[PDB]
Design an enzyme around this catalytic site. Structure first.
Site, PDB file in Angstrom:
ATOM      1  N   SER A 130     -16.173  -6.852  10.014  1.00  0.00           N
ATOM      2  CA  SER A 130     -15.315  -7.916   9.425  1.00  0.00           C
ATOM      3  C   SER A 130     -13.916  -7.374   9.173  1.00  0.00           C
ATOM      4  O   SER A 130     -13.759  -6.204   8.835  1.00  0.00           O
ATOM      5  CB  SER A 130     -15.917  -8.409   8.106  1.00  0.00           C
ATOM      6  OG  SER A 130     -17.274  -8.794   8.269  1.00  0.00           O
ATOM      7  N   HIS A 179     -17.525 -10.727  10.289  1.00  0.00           N
ATOM      8  CA  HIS A 179     -18.364 -10.354  11.435  1.00  0.00           C
ATOM      9  C   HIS A 179     -19.846 -10.392  11.079  1.00  0.00           C
ATOM     10  O   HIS A 179     -20.289  -9.666  10.199  1.00  0.00           O
ATOM     11  CB  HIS A 179     -18.020  -8.939  11.934  1.00  0.00           C
ATOM     12  CG  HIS A 179     -16.626  -8.807  12.462  1.00  0.00           C
ATOM     13  ND1 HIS A 179     -15.988  -9.825  13.137  1.00  0.00           N
ATOM     14  CD2 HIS A 179     -15.750  -7.776  12.421  1.00  0.00           C
ATOM     15  CE1 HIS A 179     -14.777  -9.429  13.485  1.00  0.00           C
ATOM     16  NE2 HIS A 179     -14.606  -8.189  13.061  1.00  0.00           N
ATOM     17  N   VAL A 186     -17.588  -6.855   3.862  1.00  0.00           N
ATOM     18  CA  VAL A 186     -18.661  -6.112   3.229  1.00  0.00           C
ATOM     19  C   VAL A 186     -18.182  -4.759   2.672  1.00  0.00           C
ATOM     20  O   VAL A 186     -17.513  -3.996   3.374  1.00  0.00           O
ATOM     21  CB  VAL A 186     -19.818  -5.905   4.242  1.00  0.00           C
ATOM     22  CG1 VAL A 186     -19.526  -4.723   5.145  1.00  0.00           C
ATOM     23  CG2 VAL A 186     -21.117  -5.721   3.517  1.00  0.00           C
ATOM     24  N   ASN A 191     -14.341  -3.194   6.350  1.00  0.00           N
ATOM     25  CA  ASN A 191     -15.619  -2.581   6.010  1.00  0.00           C
ATOM     26  C   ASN A 191     -15.496  -1.077   5.771  1.00  0.00           C
ATOM     27  O   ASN A 191     -16.492  -0.367   5.631  1.00  0.00           O
ATOM     28  CB  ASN A 191     -16.660  -2.862   7.105  1.00  0.00           C
ATOM     29  CG  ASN A 191     -16.944  -4.349   7.276  1.00  0.00           C
ATOM     30  OD1 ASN A 191     -17.192  -4.769   8.514  1.00  0.00           O
ATOM     31  ND2 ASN A 191     -16.954  -5.107   6.304  1.00  0.00           N
ATOM     32  N   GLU A 225     -17.034 -11.466  16.308  1.00  0.00           N
ATOM     33  CA  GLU A 225     -16.181 -12.580  15.911  1.00  0.00           C
ATOM     34  C   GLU A 225     -17.015 -13.843  15.739  1.00  0.00           C
ATOM     35  O   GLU A 225     -17.854 -14.172  16.587  1.00  0.00           O
ATOM     36  CB  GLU A 225     -15.111 -12.847  16.972  1.00  0.00           C
ATOM     37  CG  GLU A 225     -14.234 -11.665  17.338  1.00  0.00           C
ATOM     38  CD  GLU A 225     -13.211 -11.328  16.272  1.00  0.00           C
ATOM     39  OE1 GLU A 225     -13.326 -10.245  15.662  1.00  0.00           O
ATOM     40  OE2 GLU A 225     -12.289 -12.144  16.047  1.00  0.00           O
TER      41      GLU A 225
HETATM   42  C1  LIG Z   1     -29.812  -4.219   4.721  1.00  0.00           C
HETATM   43  C2  LIG Z   1     -28.770  -4.704   3.707  1.00  0.00           C
HETATM   44  O1  LIG Z   1     -28.904  -4.749   2.505  1.00  0.00           O
HETATM   45  O2  LIG Z   1     -27.651  -5.071   4.355  1.00  0.00           O
HETATM   46  C3  LIG Z   1     -27.507  -6.477   4.635  1.00  0.00           C
HETATM   47  C4  LIG Z   1     -26.220  -6.765   5.378  1.00  0.00           C
HETATM   48  C5  LIG Z   1     -26.024  -6.763   6.761  1.00  0.00           C
HETATM   49  C6  LIG Z   1     -27.118  -6.519   7.812  1.00  0.00           C
HETATM   50  O3  LIG Z   1     -27.002  -5.509   8.548  1.00  0.00           O
HETATM   51  O4  LIG Z   1     -28.081  -7.321   7.846  1.00  0.00           O
HETATM   52  N1  LIG Z   1     -24.672  -6.921   7.208  1.00  0.00           N
HETATM   53  C7  LIG Z   1     -24.005  -7.464   8.323  1.00  0.00           C
HETATM   54  O5  LIG Z   1     -24.363  -7.997   9.355  1.00  0.00           O
HETATM   55  C8  LIG Z   1     -22.589  -7.114   7.692  1.00  0.00           C
HETATM   56  N2  LIG Z   1     -21.888  -8.299   7.177  1.00  0.00           N
HETATM   57  C9  LIG Z   1     -20.514  -8.368   7.274  1.00  0.00           C
HETATM   58  O6  LIG Z   1     -19.835  -7.475   7.798  1.00  0.00           O
HETATM   59  C10 LIG Z   1     -19.875  -9.637   6.722  1.00  0.00           C
HETATM   60  C11 LIG Z   1     -19.470  -9.560   5.240  1.00  0.00           C
HETATM   61  C12 LIG Z   1     -18.835 -10.857   4.680  1.00  0.00           C
HETATM   62  C13 LIG Z   1     -19.716 -12.111   4.704  1.00  0.00           C
HETATM   63  O7  LIG Z   1     -20.856 -12.012   5.146  1.00  0.00           O
HETATM   64  O8  LIG Z   1     -19.217 -13.149   4.266  1.00  0.00           O
HETATM   65  C14 LIG Z   1     -23.436  -6.568   6.489  1.00  0.00           C
HETATM   66  S1  LIG Z   1     -23.453  -7.536   4.968  1.00  0.00           S
HETATM   67  C15 LIG Z   1     -25.094  -7.011   4.350  1.00  0.00           C
END
Ligand SMILES: CC(=O)OCC1=C(C(=O)O)N2C(=O)[C@@H](NC(=O)CCCC(=O)O)[C@H]2SC1
EC number: 3.5.1.93
Lengths: 152, 520
Positions: B1, B23, B70, B244, B455
């Site tokens: 992101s 992202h 994040v 991030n 994206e």
């Molecule tokens: C396992 C755990 O606790 O992690 C869960 C988790 C995952 C993941 O890997 O599932 N993430 C993504 O796919 C990333 N999200 C972003 O970069 C967007 C942040 C902003 C938004 O979402 O509005 C991070 S956010 C938290």
């Protein structure tokens, strides 16, 4: 200098554009949340109902085995019940908005039952608590405390 | 992101600029973003949010706007318990567990539901789970007493002033995320938000692992106030950003450093190449216009190449294998940008996979390690060119095996496919330095691959009067079976042809394709 004059909606209506982007207009807050609820039901109704369903801790009950892990995770952390608590602890103003949102989702399904996948029809009707629960699940038990880090 | 906020002084017209660029997975249901616009006599809100949420997390209007990334706030602890005599050892004594027998229904293949027992044991820490290896773990989640998450966001985005905005955030009801702000008044802000437990010892790494669950020494009970967290407002640099990466380079020049906060808040690891490109794209440019701002968002630089090719290419040329030599010349002739027509791109990734690990984050192979003192120009070079070439030898095999040749066009293997729309891809892995992100999947039997993550919702707003904004949703505004609004934007994404976002009543009326009256 000063922001352009705000528009004063004199009736409730959603004006959709060429890309399926809803423009919700409400004569007041609750109206706008109802429109929003309706719009989201129209556009992603199936998955929203499914997710709300899991938030109640009934994923395994509604759709079986492939949802049992999550069910256990959310129950042991008492998410569904804490959701009822958080719902009750909301402010009167905002709780009204949350209620409208759920009503909107319900209303859309009532006027368009054909657009709802059979498998998630059992979730209806939804409530403000359901809205709160899912949010609580997303924030605290998906982003912050994931079942992965606790289990391996 | 990604996230950017530009102070008026850094722009041409003098109005603040904001970038929303989260992202997330393109398939995970609860991660799907939706675009909407709400209007009442008392407020207005345009933006994207996760499906199911009654509030718009990524919102803006004629007055203000915010965005999220994040930060990983470690709001929970996993304690390792020491089982003993039916209970667990704590502060020198065998304490008992809190046991609650609950139950739930499991749907059967035939449609009937079986009742299943579920025992919930708790320690003073929290719920107890047992891992496959037999380890008893108790999880303690902070902020379980913050019922106002949704309303905080609602007040935040409907705030009439930055002050009210900060007042809202101060309630500490949103457990995580980095949040950026910007308004028509000219204020920009960055905030490492979330609910963090107060601790007297241990670095972040310590708290991310199994903490001892046999002593009241590690049982925290309080959380930090907004003022204990890293924050930046109207910095000298004229902008804020976060991709991030740890909060140690939110702006240039910085306004604080790691030593100013407890070591358990954020990590102090090497910033990703994409994050480095972020600081460079903003600090290196002045007098920005919305148009120029959007253009910078499209950056797809293979920064990893700039850091390694100078050392690899020469060494690879002295290898006896004529194919390794040809590969070296192919790479060396590349303009190091992830474009659709790049014949070197794919081969380069395969090399990087081995040189820097599968996630491209590996550091052990650079000559010069990363340093917070040179945050946007380290690490650099290849430590062992000899070994690096063997890795290239392998990459050549892996590339041919995966795509059918070492010089196949990037955009021929990388496609963005939704429904019946099939268009050429560009940009790619963020860890290789690409600002615009498209985490390509593994290729199929025919070397074809598509975005699995990257994206999603992309908007850029100029807080002029009235405000001006453009955006695009990679996967459309709907996923209901049979909708025409799922793959009708991917074509514009492939050309970076953004939609002007409509806020003004006249505009909305001019583009309306369906009226839905309603009564509540
Ligand atoms: C396992 C755990 O606790 O992690 C869960 C988790 C995952 C993941 O890997 O599932 N993430 C993504 O796919 C990333 N999200 C972003 O970069 C967007 C942040 C902003 C938004 O979402 O509005 C991070 S956010 C938290």
């Amino acid at each position: 200098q000063a922001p352009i004059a705000a528009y004063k909606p004199r009736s409730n209506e959603i004006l959709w554009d060429g890309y399926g982007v809803p423009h919700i207009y409400g004569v007041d807050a609750p109206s706008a949340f109802y429109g929003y609820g309706w719009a989201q039901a129209r556009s992603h109704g199936d998955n929203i109902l499914r997710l709300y369903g899991e938030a109640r801790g009934k994923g395994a009950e509604y759709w079986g085995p492939d949802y049992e892990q999550t069910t256990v995770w959310l129950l042991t952390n008492g998410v569904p019940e804490r959701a009822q608590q958080w719902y009750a602890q909301q402010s009167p103003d905002f709780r009204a908005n949350l209620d409208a949102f759920a009503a909107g989702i319900n209303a859309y399904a009532q006027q368009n039952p054909d657009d709802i996948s059979p498998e998630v029809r059992q979730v209806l009707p939804v409530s403000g608590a359901d809205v709160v629960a899912h949010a609580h699940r997303l924030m605290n038990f998906l982003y912050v405390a994931s079942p992965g880090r606790t289990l391996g | 992101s990604n996230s950017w906020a530009v102070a008026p002084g850094k722009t041409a017209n003098g109005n603040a600029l904001l970038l929303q660029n989260p992202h997330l997975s393109w398939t995970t249901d609860y991660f799907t973003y939706y675009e909407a616009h709400l209007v009442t006599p008392d407020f207005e809100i345009y933006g994207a949010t996760q499906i199911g949420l009654p509030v718009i997390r990524f919102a803006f209007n004629q007055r203000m706007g915010i965005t999220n990334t994040v930060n990983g706030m470690v709001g929970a602890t996993n304690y390792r318990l020491t089982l003993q005599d039916g209970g667990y050892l704590y502060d020198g004594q065998v304490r008992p567990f809190e046991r609650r027998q609950a139950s739930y229904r499991l749907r059967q293949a035939d449609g009937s539901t079986v009742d299943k027992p579920l025992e919930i044991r708790s320690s003073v820490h929290g719920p107890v789970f047992e891992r496959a290896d037999g380890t008893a773990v108790a999880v303690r989640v902070a902020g379980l007493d913050r019922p106002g998450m949704l309303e905080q966001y609602f007040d935040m985005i409907t705030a009439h002033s930055f002050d009210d905005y900060e007042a809202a955030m101060a309630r500490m009801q949103v457990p995580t995320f980095n949040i950026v702000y910007a308004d028509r008044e000219g204020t920009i802000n960055y905030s490492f938000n979330g609910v963090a437990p107060k601790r007297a010892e241990g670095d972040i790494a310590f708290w991310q692992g199994n903490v001892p669950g046999d002593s009241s020494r590690y049982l925290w009970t309080e959380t930090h106030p907004l003022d204990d967290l890293p924050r930046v407002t109207n910095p000298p640099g004229g902008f804020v950003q976060n991709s991030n990466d740890p909060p140690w380079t939110p702006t240039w020049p910085v306004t604080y450093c790691p030593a100013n906060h407890p070591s358990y808040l954020a990590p102090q690891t090497p910033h990703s190449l994409r994050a480095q490109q972020s600081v460079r794209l903003m600090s290196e440019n002045d007098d920005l216009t919305l148009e120029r701002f959007m253009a910078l968002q499209f950056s797809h630089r293979a920064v990893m190449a700039d850091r390694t090719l100078p050392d690899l290419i020469p060494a690879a040329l002295i290898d006896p294998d004529p194919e390794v030599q040809a590969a070296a010349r192919l790479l060396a002739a590349w303009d190091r940008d992830f474009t659709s027509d790049s014949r070197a791109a794919l081969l380069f990734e395969e090399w990087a996979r081995l040189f820097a690990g599968q996630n491209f984050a590996g550091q052990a192979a650079f000559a010069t390690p990363w340093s917070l003192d040179k945050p946007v120009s380290t690490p650099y070079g290849v430590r062992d060119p000899k070994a690096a070439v063997d890795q290239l030898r392998t990459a050549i095999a892996n590339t041919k095996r995966k795509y059918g040749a070492i010089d196949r066009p990037f955009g021929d293997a990388s496609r963005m496919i939704l429904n019946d729309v099939n268009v050429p891809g560009a940009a790619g892995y963020g860890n290789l330095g690409s600002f615009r992100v498209f985490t390509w999947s593994d290729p199929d039997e025919n070397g074809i691959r598509t975005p699995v993550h990257g994206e999603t919702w992309v908007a850029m707003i100029e807080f002029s009067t009235p405000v001006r904004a453009y955006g695009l949703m990679s996967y459309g505004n709907s996923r209901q079976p049979g909708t025409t609004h799922y793959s009708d934007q991917i074509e514009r994404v492939s050309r970076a042809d953004f939609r002007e976002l409509l806020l003004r009543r006249e505009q909305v009326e001019a583009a309306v394709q369906e009226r839905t009256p309603f009564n509540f």
